[PDB]
Ligand binder design. Structure first.
Ligand SMILES: Cc1cc(N2CCN(C)[C@@H](C)C2)ncc1-c1ccc(-c2nc3c(CO)cccc3c(=O)[nH]2)cc1
Ligand SMILES: [Zn+2]
Length: 210
């Protein structure tokens, strides 16, 4: 459906809040930077607010159903999502028919509290072949994009190791993978696309350390 992208000004508190969450949640990955590249900082190019009436309608309708099953609590969290399918997401919304089958919690839609974890999926699973132009997973030239999303978690089912599932457990609305001594970083899983709204579209580069 019809999507409008509104540019946030770098001087605005809103743009600054999104960049602060993005920059401050960067951490070192176990693959030594193979999937997302080697960097300790991003160069934020643009931050846009995604406006889509039909997506907002579907998200708000689902929030009400979740609230009803969760003592009138949405349990909403702002979380990162990196994907080669950014264009489809901002126009058509998140779709569980395009879930990550290979995911450690089964065929769900995966979100991160660490921007660096989502950066590992911008070009595909495991970084795929990298940027389309230079076939480089650590490309410092190409402008990357990721989303900072409103995610309705409702009643979360907490897990610490791999358990493949198709849907959240009975009475639950999401699955959370927690880090332990185990997972390196937390993973947030929804099994219904309408439980996430792609609120912010961030255009950035990973920065090559000096
Ligand atoms: C589902 C899929 C198919 C595909 N394909 C292209 C080639 N082909 C067209 C098909 C084979 C299909 N490429 C990428 C994805 C995909 C996209 C994003 C993620 C993703 N995962 C995350 C995780 C998983 O642990 C944790 C934390 C955060 C994230 C995150 O932000 N994003 C996973 C997979
Ligand atoms: Zn490139």
């Amino acid at each position: 459906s019809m999507t409008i992208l509104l540019d946030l000004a770098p001087e605005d508190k809103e743009y600054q809040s999104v960049e602060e969450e993005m920059q401050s949640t960067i951490r070192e990955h176990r693959d030594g930077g193979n999937a997302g590249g080697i960097f300790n900082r991003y160069n934020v190019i643009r931050i846009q607010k995604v406006v889509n009436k039909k997506l907002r309608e579907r998200f708000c309708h689902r929030q009400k159903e979740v609230s009803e099953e969760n003592h009138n609590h949405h349990n909403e969290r702002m979380l990162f999502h990196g994907s080669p399918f950014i264009n489809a997401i901002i126009h058509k919304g998140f779709d569980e028919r395009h879930a990550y089958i290979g995911g450690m919690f089964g065929a769900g839609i995966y979100f991160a509290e660490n921007s660096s974890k989502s950066n590992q999926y911008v070009y595909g699973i495991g970084g795929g072949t990298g940027c389309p132009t230079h076939k480089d997973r650590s490309c410092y030239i190409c402008h990357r994009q990721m989303l900072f999303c409103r995610v309705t978690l409702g009643k979360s089912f907490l897990q610490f190791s791999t358990i493949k599932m198709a849907h959240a457990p009975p009475g639950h609305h999401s699955v959370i993978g927690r880090p332990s001594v185990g997972l390196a970083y937390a993973e947030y899983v929804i099994y219904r696309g309408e439980q996430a709204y792609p609120e912010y579209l961030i255009t950035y580069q990973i920065m090559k350390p000096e």
